[PDB]
Amino acid sequence: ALTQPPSVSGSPGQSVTISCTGTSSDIGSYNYVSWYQQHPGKAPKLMIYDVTQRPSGVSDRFSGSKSGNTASLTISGLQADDEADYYCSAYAGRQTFYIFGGGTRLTV
Amino acid sequence: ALTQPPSVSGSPGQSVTISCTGTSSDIGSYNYVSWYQQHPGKAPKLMIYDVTQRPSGVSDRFSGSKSGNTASLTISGLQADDEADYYCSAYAGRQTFYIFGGGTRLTV
Amino acid sequence: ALTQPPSVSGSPGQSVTISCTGTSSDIGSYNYVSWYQQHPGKAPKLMIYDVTQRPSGVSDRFSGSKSGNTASLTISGLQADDEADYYCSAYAGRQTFYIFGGGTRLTV
Amino acid sequence: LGFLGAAGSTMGAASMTLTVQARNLLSHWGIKQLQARVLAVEHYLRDQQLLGIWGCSGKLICCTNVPWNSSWSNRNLSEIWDNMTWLQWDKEISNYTQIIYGLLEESQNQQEKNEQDLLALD
Amino acid sequence: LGFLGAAGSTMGAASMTLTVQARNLLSHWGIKQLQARVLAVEHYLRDQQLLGIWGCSGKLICCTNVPWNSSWSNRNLSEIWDNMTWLQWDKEISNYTQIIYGLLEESQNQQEKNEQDLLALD
Amino acid sequence: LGFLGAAGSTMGAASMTLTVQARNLLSHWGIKQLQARVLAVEHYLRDQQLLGIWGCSGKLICCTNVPWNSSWSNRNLSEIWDNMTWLQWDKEISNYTQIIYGLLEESQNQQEKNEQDLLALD
Amino acid sequence: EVQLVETGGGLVQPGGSLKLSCRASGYTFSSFAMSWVRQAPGKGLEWVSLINDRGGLTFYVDSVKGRFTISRDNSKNTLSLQMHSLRDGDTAVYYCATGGMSSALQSSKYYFDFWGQGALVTV
Amino acid sequence: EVQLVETGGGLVQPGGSLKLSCRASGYTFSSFAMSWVRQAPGKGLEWVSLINDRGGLTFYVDSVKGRFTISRDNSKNTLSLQMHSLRDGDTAVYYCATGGMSSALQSSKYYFDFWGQGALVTV
Amino acid sequence: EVQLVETGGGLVQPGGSLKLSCRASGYTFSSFAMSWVRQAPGKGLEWVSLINDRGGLTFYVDSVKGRFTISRDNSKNTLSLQMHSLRDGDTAVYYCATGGMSSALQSSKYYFDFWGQGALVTV
Ligand SMILES: *[C@@H]1O[C@H](CO)[C@@H](O[C@@H]2O[C@H](CO)[C@@H](O)[C@H](O)[C@H]2NC(C)=O)[C@H](O)[C@H]1NC(C)=O
Ligand SMILES: *[C@@H]1O[C@H](CO)[C@@H](O[C@@H]2O[C@H](CO)[C@@H](O)[C@H](O)[C@H]2NC(C)=O)[C@H](O)[C@H]1NC(C)=O
Ligand SMILES: *[C@@H]1O[C@H](CO)[C@@H](O[C@@H]2O[C@H](CO)[C@@H](O)[C@H](O)[C@H]2NC(C)=O)[C@H](O)[C@H]1NC(C)=O
Ligand SMILES: *[C@@H]1O[C@H](CO)[C@@H](O)[C@H](O)[C@H]1NC(C)=O
Ligand SMILES: *[C@@H]1O[C@H](CO)[C@@H](O)[C@H](O)[C@H]1NC(C)=O
Ligand SMILES: *[C@@H]1O[C@H](CO)[C@@H](O)[C@H](O)[C@H]1NC(C)=O
Ligand SMILES: *[C@@H]1O[C@H](CO)[C@@H](O)[C@H](O)[C@H]1NC(C)=O
Ligand SMILES: *[C@@H]1O[C@H](CO)[C@@H](O)[C@H](O)[C@H]1NC(C)=O
Ligand SMILES: *[C@@H]1O[C@H](CO)[C@@H](O)[C@H](O)[C@H]1NC(C)=O
Ligand SMILES: *[C@@H]1O[C@H](CO)[C@@H](O)[C@H](O)[C@H]1NC(C)=O
Ligand SMILES: *[C@@H]1O[C@H](CO)[C@@H](O)[C@H](O)[C@H]1NC(C)=O
Ligand SMILES: *[C@@H]1O[C@H](CO)[C@@H](O)[C@H](O)[C@H]1NC(C)=O
């Protein structure tokens, strides 16, 4: 699995970073790392895809990047509405197809 | 190997069942399970093939079936002449070709 | 690796044999076993190739053979100038390409 | 044997002479002789085009993913290969030829698309 | 649809009718009719020869190792396949056809040589 | 180079120009001109048929399972590829061409049958 | 509005079987690849299976490779999953999702755009 | 009457080699695939090798894969087995048998119809 | 006179990278396959990588397979090796050598004919 360690937090209005560490070939070679916002009892919402892209419906608060074998999600100024688990996932070379990371909890 | 546990017995005229348990993909997926009658010092004789078929020269006493991952040989009314070891074998997916079971002894 | 055990020696003018033992498929199936003369701080020189061949520039002193899964280098009458480490190597079936043996030291 | 020597042989036995037959497909008055040669070429190319379309472009014998329907003159398996000649077989299933060919074309286009998708998986 | 039925369809949709088009390439006064048939055959063979040369000898659809150059009318990916017909595409890149073909031939000869070397590794 | 530019080059060097030569095989009075074109097509098809029969249907270069016999003008390996032209080679082995072709056909039919059997192993 | 709605599920004994299904609308069903994603109670997300848009190519996570079947019916706009030889380890919410692989003519994604709410399967 | 008759065998030192052969009649030799089956003294049956009817395809159990050769001569109606680099673990009766794979035109069997009596090999 | 002359090398921190190169003359560069061979301080010889004469086929020892790149420029008569993600275990002299595989038209060798003196790489 990918690792997104527990836990991330901050006050409303502060920025936070949620990490996602892979291994070697998975997020190292493939620029297909996505991030999801998981509410406690609701289906997850897509925030980030590829490395830096976000779908329509996702605000400017969510952005991200990748370097080496580690990816991250950045929230530019945290809202109380962002108290969700975050998950990263990535393409796994047509061998395992997709690897989800252990997720991590964001507290505002 | 396939397992045909020791031992099976009965009085003359009684029916008996000889089992043959496989694993998952071998006798589960391939309907090519045969049974042989092995005399103590003679080459084995074919009794059953596929699942339910028998060659000419084999009497009505021998019949059989398969379900799940387990096969069996049924003797409809046991003769003293049937005191032989029984062996089951099956096709193994072009990987190992044929798997013989450990055999089992029939006593009348 | 291939094994050329330590150590080989003899007086000037004596013949010596340097062994190289492989496994099964490597020098057993491929007649591509070479020998090199390694000076203490210089690049190695090719002595033997295939099984019995030697390149121009290599004198009659160096000859060799292979049998079973073991190869050897023969020096027909040892010079003080032959105090070098010897290495054997061989083709490895397009899997590992080349296997070098642990080398061995010749003392005159 | 030689050309058509296997014509009276069983279908199974005759499968060993495909090479022989294949080579003999290629190996004003004069204008009609020329016309005949041109038409022979077009016929040859049509057979080759079908083999290409069906995914069997460079083989005398090949397999496909179309199952045999029992409605297509089910005559067992060993009876067809051991006790029948190709001349007879060609009559036994003459009304199914177009059906089979259509199926062979469809179960190729499906395969090419699946291969194309797989080649796009990084 | 039928022959050329997909001509007004998008490039993507039309990829499913390649079989239909392929079959309709084959399926003194009289001498000019004969000449036309001969020329049609030569044309057919030239297209087949290119597919052979490029390493795509028995496929209606195949992939190559030549990257698409952005200079060759970069029109995105989904725009080409979903909002354009083949007739339009053939004009969008008409000046690059010879360049592409040359590249396809070169990045075949390189592949055949690499395969030949690998088959010589014991 | 260009067409036949490699004719005087060594066999090895000339192996890089196969594409060039292949493309130039395709690229009452009038009736004799028409006849010549038809015959050229038949010749072309015969060469293609052999490549198909031998299991080398879509390659300019391919390998086979027929060993080289030393009786077939054994001229070493490097001497043939580096110090000889194709024109010379074609004379060095002109009396073995039919033998080699027969072997190439046989050691194909054997391969097709083995492949067919393997595809029947569940 | 794109919606994926799962049904089926329930508690099944280990060694048993069940089938899930997902109906979908708001998009052309036949234009997208789909998958099932597992949410174990405390694990969150595991990929289980992927099917292409024509329903001809399927891929599985090794752990269900010999047990699960992913299938489609594009006339019904239905995705389905047949799970055999169930284990307790398969207890999870199973989500219907669109995304993953594509047609090779249309900007392959390798991510999931839409999610249903998921069926709950207990074993 | 179909008969398979083995010869050869005997005691050989570990690390040595020997060859077995089987003559056969009562059927067209060339019409059937054949195999060798091992009967270790107390194990009963182990498959060792399979050869098709034309003598072109051979298959082996992994344990003899790098050591044994199975071969045929259809003019002699002879099946043979060359065993190299023998181990004590190879002590067994080796049976000549007809069956296993087939021609793909003729009802593949995947079972053995006939057995010889077997050669005894001790290592 | 055939000569292979290495350059580059030096001490690099673990996790870093460096590139080696070898210039060569006295022979047609483009006519021979080349390789890099490692001489660890006390191990003597380990094969690392092989490249064919046209620079299109490369082979690696598994231990550097995901880290090293072997490349050629036949106009410059230069062989080169890029080593990424270096480990202490890679400390060695790296030799430029000609030999190994060949063109398949020219008496494949499977041995090394010429050696340079090698670059020293410390990690
Ligand atoms: C074998 O051929 C028969 C005859 O055409 C097929 O049966 C028909 O299948 C269609 C499919 O919708 C039905 O509408 C027809 O009514 C069927 N005909 C009869 C007489 O029942 C059959 O499906 C074919 N089987 C295979 C495996 O292709
Ligand atoms: C795409 O096409 C362009 C245009 O021909 C190529 O650019 C040329 O590359 C050559 C290579 O030496 C240069 O000399 C030219 O000056 C380049 N032209 C321009 C306008 O810069 C380009 O390399 C091609 N790209 C690919 C990937 O093939
Ligand atoms: C190479 O060609 C020679 C010449 O034809 C072959 O030798 C002949 O083999 C047949 C086989 O039965 C013998 O009957 C002939 O008497 C042989 N001729 C001579 C002159 O000895 C040879 O076998 C061929 N080798 C290969 C590998 O095909
Ligand atoms: C013709 O029929 C006879 C009947 O026994 C058979 O032996 C013979 O081989 C057949 N010939 C061919 C060419 O099949
Ligand atoms: C038809 O196939 C069955 C399948 O076993 C076979 O037993 C039967 O003999 C065959 N009939 C003929 C005429 O060959
Ligand atoms: C084809 O249809 C005709 C129509 O009468 C029938 O007589 C003939 O036997 C059919 N052929 C086959 C192979 O069924
Ligand atoms: C023609 O254009 C219309 C516009 O909506 C489209 O719906 C239709 O499918 C098109 N026809 C073809 C053959 O693409
Ligand atoms: C061009 O490609 C980009 C890549 O994401 C896409 O977003 C954009 O919509 C495309 N343009 C058109 C006209 O499709
Ligand atoms: C091809 O070149 C001509 C020269 O004027 C130009 O007008 C035309 O648009 C070009 N075609 C393409 C596809 O660029
Ligand atoms: C012709 O022979 C000369 C002799 O040195 C050689 O250099 C030249 O390359 C040859 N030309 C061709 C086309 O091989
Ligand atoms: C013939 O082949 C041998 C094999 O090593 C080679 O040494 C010899 O030089 C070759 N002869 C010629 C003329 O190339
Ligand atoms: C072919 O046979 C003729 C018969 O005299 C002989 O002169 C010629 O040299 C032979 N060609 C070859 C390649 O041996």
* Distance separating alpha carbons of residues C36 and C45, to the nearest angstrom: 5
Cβ pair H100, H47 in contact under 8 A = no
* Distance separating alpha carbons of residues I53 and I41, to the nearest angstrom: 30
Q: Which residues pair with A72 in a beta bridge?
A: A19, A65
Residue in this structure with the two tokens 């499968």, named with its chain if needed? D15
DSSP H/E element including F113: helix F97-118
Tell me the CA–centroid distance for residue E91 and ligand 9, in Å.
Answer: 9
Chain E's closest residue to G103, CA to CA, is E12
For B11, D58, E75, F10, F20, the CA distances from F5, given in Å and listed in that order, are: 92, 31, 40, 11, 9
* Distance separating alpha carbons of residues C21 and D114, to the nearest angstrom: 50
- How many separate domains does chain C show? 1
Phi, psi of D42 (to 5 degrees): -60, -40
Which positions ≥6 away from D119 have C-beta within 8 Å?
E63, G104
Cβ pair A32, A99 in contact under 8 A = no
Interface A:E, ≥3 CB–CB pairs < 8 Å = no
Task: Determine if the peptide bond prior to C7 is cis (ω within 30°).
Answer: yes
Q: How many CB atoms lie within 10 A of CB D49?
A: 18
Biggest distance spanned by C-alpha atoms of chain E:
63
Residue nearest to atom 9 of ligand 7 (CA): E9
Phi, psi of B5 (to 5 degrees): -70, 150
Phi, psi of B29 (to 5 degrees): -90, -25
User: In three state form, how does the secondary structure of F15-41 look?
Assistant: HHHHHHHHHCCCCCCHHHHHHHHHHHH
DSSP string over G85-122 = S--GGG-EEEEEEEESS--SSS----SEEEE---EEEE
| DSSP SS3 for B16 | strand
Residue in this structure with the two tokens 């013949």, named with its chain if needed? C15
Output the six-digit token pair for A20. 């996602």
Query: Burial of B13 by CB count in 10 Å (0-12 exposed, 13-18 middle, 19+ buried)?
Result: exposed
* Distance separating alpha carbons of residues D80 and D85, to the nearest angstrom: 8
Q: How many CB atoms lie within 10 A of CB H66?
A: 13
* Distance separating alpha carbons of residues I116 and I4, to the nearest angstrom: 4
Cβ pair F3, F24 in contact under 8 A = yes
Indicate if the alpha-carbon torsion angle F86, F88, F92, F96 is positive or negative: positive
* Distance separating alpha carbons of residues I68 and I58, to the nearest angstrom: 11
Output the six-digit token pair for E88. 């339009």
Cβ pair G53, G31 in contact under 8 A = yes
* Distance separating alpha carbons of residues F41 and F57, to the nearest angstrom: 17
Q: Which residues pair with H49 in a beta bridge?
A: H36, H60
Q: How many CB atoms lie within 10 A of CB F93?
A: 14
Cβ pair E48, F26 in contact under 8 A = no
* Distance separating alpha carbons of residues F28 and F33, to the nearest angstrom: 10
Taking the CA atoms of residue C71, residue C76, residue C82 and residue C83 in that order, the dihedral angle to the nearest 10 degrees is 70
Cβ pair I38, I92 in contact under 8 A = yes
Pocket of ligand 5 (CB under 6 A): D 76, 78-79
In 3D, which of D41, D62, D42, D43 has the Cα closest to residue D51?
Answer: D62
Output the six-digit token pair for A26. 């998975």
Q: Which atom of ligand 6 is nearest to the CA of D94?
A: 13
Cβ pair G50, G70 in contact under 8 A = yes
* Distance separating alpha carbons of residues C20 and C8, to the nearest angstrom: 12
* Distance separating alpha carbons of residues F34 and E37, to the nearest angstrom: 11
Interface G:C, ≥3 CB–CB pairs < 8 Å = no
Interface test with G, best of D107, D112, D121, D122 (most G CBs within 10 A): D121
Contact E117 I110 (CB under 8 A): no
Phi, psi of H12 (to 5 degrees): -130, 150
Residues of E in contact with G106 (CB under 8 A): 12, 77-78, 81-82
Q: Strands, DSSP E only, in chain F?
A: none
Taking the CA atoms of residue G95, residue G100, residue G103 and residue G105 in that order, the dihedral angle to the nearest 10 degrees is 140
Which positions ≥6 away from G2 have C-beta within 8 Å?
G24, G25, G26, G27, G98, G114
Which positions ≥6 away from D102 have C-beta within 8 Å?
none
Residue nearest to atom 14 of ligand 10 (CA): F9
Which positions ≥6 away from B2 have C-beta within 8 Å?
B20, B21, B22, B26, B27, B71, B88, B89, B90, B99, B100, B101, B102
Chain I's closest residue to C43, CA to CA, is I117
Residue nearest to atom 3 of ligand 8 (CA): E76
* Distance separating alpha carbons of residues I47 and C2, to the nearest angstrom: 13
* Distance separating alpha carbons of residues H115 and A91, to the nearest angstrom: 54
Give helix F30-53 / helix E30-53 axis angle, nearest 10°: 30
* Distance separating alpha carbons of residues E4 and E25, to the nearest angstrom: 12
Side chain identity at E118, as an amino acid letter? L
In 3D, which of I70, I60, I64, I2 has the Cα closest to residue I31?
Answer: I2
Please give the interface size between E and I, counted as residue pairs whose CB atoms are below 8 Å apart.
Answer: 23
Pairing relation of β-strands A85-91 and A104-107?
Answer: antiparallel
| C-alpha count within 13 angstroms, C-beta hemisphere, residue C12 | 3
In 3D, which of E107, E84, E108, E104 has the Cα closest to residue E96?
Answer: E104
Residues of H in contact with B45 (CB under 8 A): 115
Interface test with F, best of D15, D16, D18, D19 (most F CBs within 10 A): D19
Distance from CA of F117 to the nearest CA of H (A): 6
Which positions ≥6 away from B7 have C-beta within 8 Å?
B104, B105, B106, B107
In 3D, which of C102, C43, C31, C14 has the Cα closest to residue C68?
Answer: C31
Contacts 24+ apart (CB under 8 A), F86-92: F86/F7, F86/F11, F86/F14, F87/F7, F89/F11
Chain A's closest residue to D121, CA to CA, is A94
DSSP string over C17-66 = EEEEE--SSHHHH---EEEEEE-TTS--EEEEBTTTB--TT--TTEEEEE
Which positions ≥6 away from C71 have C-beta within 8 Å?
C2, C19, C20, C21, C22, C27, C33, C51, C64, C65, C88, C90
For A28, A52, C2, C64, D37, the CA distances from A47, given in Å and listed in that order, are: 20, 10, 55, 69, 68
| DSSP SS3 for F51 | helix
- Using the Cβ of E116 and the Cβ atoms of chain F, whether some distance falls under 8 Å is answered with yes
Taking the CA atoms of residue D100, residue D106, residue D111 and residue D114 in that order, the dihedral angle to the nearest 10 degrees is -160
Q: What's chain I's Rg over C-alpha atoms?
A: 14
- Using the Cβ of F36 and the Cβ atoms of chain D, whether some distance falls under 8 Å is answered with no
Q: Which atom of ligand 9 is nearest to the CA of E96?
A: 13
- Cα D105 to chain center, whole Å? 13
* Distance separating alpha carbons of residues I52 and I34, to the nearest angstrom: 6
Phi, psi of C29 (to 5 degrees): -90, -25
* Distance separating alpha carbons of residues G55 and G71, to the nearest angstrom: 6
- Cα G92 to chain center, whole Å? 12
* Distance separating alpha carbons of residues A59 and D52, to the nearest angstrom: 53
Cβ pair I65, I119 in contact under 8 A = no
Q: How many CB atoms lie within 10 A of CB E86?
A: 14
* Distance separating alpha carbons of residues C27 and D95, to the nearest angstrom: 61
Interface test with F, best of I28, I53, I106 (most F CBs within 10 A): I106
Query: Burial of I117 by CB count in 10 Å (0-12 exposed, 13-18 middle, 19+ buried)?
Result: middle
For C66, H21, H22, H51, H82, the CA distances from H86, given in Å and listed in that order, are: 22, 17, 20, 21, 10
Output the six-digit token pair for F73. 């003008």
Task: Determine if the peptide bond prior to B7 is cis (ω within 30°).
Answer: yes
Cβ pair C52, C63 in contact under 8 A = yes
| DSSP SS3 for D42 | helix
Q: Strands, DSSP E only, in chain I?
A: 3-8, 10-11, 18-25, 34-39, 46-51, 58-60, 68-73, 78-83, 92-99, 112-115, 119-122
DSSP string over G29-56 = GGGS-EEEEEE-TTT--EEEEEE-TTS-
User: In three state form, how does the secondary structure of E36-100 look?
Assistant: HHHHHHHHHHHHHHHHHHCCCCCCCCCCCCCCCCCCCCCCCCHHHHHCCCHHHHHHHCCCCHHHH
Residues ending a continuous segment of chain D before a break (C–N > 2.5 Å)? 27
* Distance separating alpha carbons of residues F117 and H100, to the nearest angstrom: 12
Q: Which residues pair with I81 in a beta bridge?
A: I20, I70
Side chain identity at I19, as an amino acid letter? K
Q: How many CB atoms lie within 10 A of CB F74?
A: 11
What proportions of chain C, in percent to the nearest 5, are helix, strand and coil? 5, 45, 45
Q: Go through chain E and tell me how many residues it has.
A: 122
In 3D, which of I102, I56, I72, I2 has the Cα closest to residue F82?
Answer: I102
Angle at the Cα of B51 (from B48 to B57), degrees rounded to 5? 25
Please give the interface size between E and F, counted as residue pairs whose CB atoms are below 8 Å apart.
Answer: 48
Output the six-digit token pair for G87. 């284990």
- Using the Cβ of D120 and the Cβ atoms of chain A, whether some distance falls under 8 Å is answered with no
CB of E79 within 6 A of ligand 8: the answer is yes
Chain D neighbors (3+ CB pairs < 8 Å): A, E, F, G, H
Considering only CB atoms, which residues of chain H are within 8 Å of chain B? 43-47, 50, 59, 61-62, 95, 100, 109-113, 115-118
Interface G:H, ≥3 CB–CB pairs < 8 Å = no
Cβ pair H89, H100 in contact under 8 A = no
Cβ pair D10, D85 in contact under 8 A = yes
Which positions ≥6 away from B18 have C-beta within 8 Å?
B4, B8, B35, B72, B73, B74, B75, B86, B88, B104, B106
Contact F117 H110 (CB under 8 A): no
Contact G104 D120 (CB under 8 A): yes
Q: Which residues pair with A102 in a beta bridge?
A: A3
Chain E neighbors (3+ CB pairs < 8 Å): C, D, F, G, I
Residues of I in contact with F12 (CB under 8 A): 103, 105-106
Write down the H helix ranges in chain B.
26-29
Output the six-digit token pair for F52. 């198909």
Binding-face residues of D in 72-111 toward G, CB within 8 A:
110
Which positions ≥6 away from F83 have C-beta within 8 Å?
F10
Chain H neighbors (3+ CB pairs < 8 Å): B, D, F
Distance from CA of D81 to the nearest CA of H (A): 7
| C-alpha count within 13 angstroms, C-beta hemisphere, residue F77 | 9
In 3D, which of C102, C53, C93, C97 has the Cα closest to residue C73?
Answer: C53
Output the six-digit token pair for I63. 């231990």
* Distance separating alpha carbons of residues G28 and I83, to the nearest angstrom: 49
- Using the Cβ of D115 and the Cβ atoms of chain A, whether some distance falls under 8 Å is answered with no
* Distance separating alpha carbons of residues D53 and B44, to the nearest angstrom: 50
Pairing relation of β-strands C2-3 and C98-102?
Answer: parallel
For G60, G76, G84, G87, H108, the CA distances from B26, given in Å and listed in that order, are: 21, 36, 17, 21, 17
Q: Which residues pair with E87 in a beta bridge?
A: none
Residues ending a continuous segment of chain B before a break (C–N > 2.5 Å)? none
Cβ pair G111, A46 in contact under 8 A = yes
Q: Go through chain H and tell me how many residues it has.
A: 123
Output the six-digit token pair for A25. 């070939």
Residue in this structure with the two tokens 């080169």, named with its chain if needed? I80
Residue nearest to atom 8 of ligand 6 (CA): D95
Give helix E30-53 / helix D30-53 axis angle, nearest 10°: 30
Taking the CA atoms of residue D44, residue D50, residue D55 and residue D59 in that order, the dihedral angle to the nearest 10 degrees is -30
Taking the CA atoms of residue C35, residue C40, residue C45 and residue C48 in that order, the dihedral angle to the nearest 10 degrees is -20
Residues of G in contact with D116 (CB under 8 A): 104
* Distance separating alpha carbons of residues E115 and E58, to the nearest angstrom: 19
Cβ pair F42, D26 in contact under 8 A = yes
* Distance separating alpha carbons of residues D40 and D30, to the nearest angstrom: 16
Cβ pair A37, A82 in contact under 8 A = yes
Interface H:B, ≥3 CB–CB pairs < 8 Å = yes
In 3D, which of E118, E15, E111 has the Cα closest to residue E56?
Answer: E111
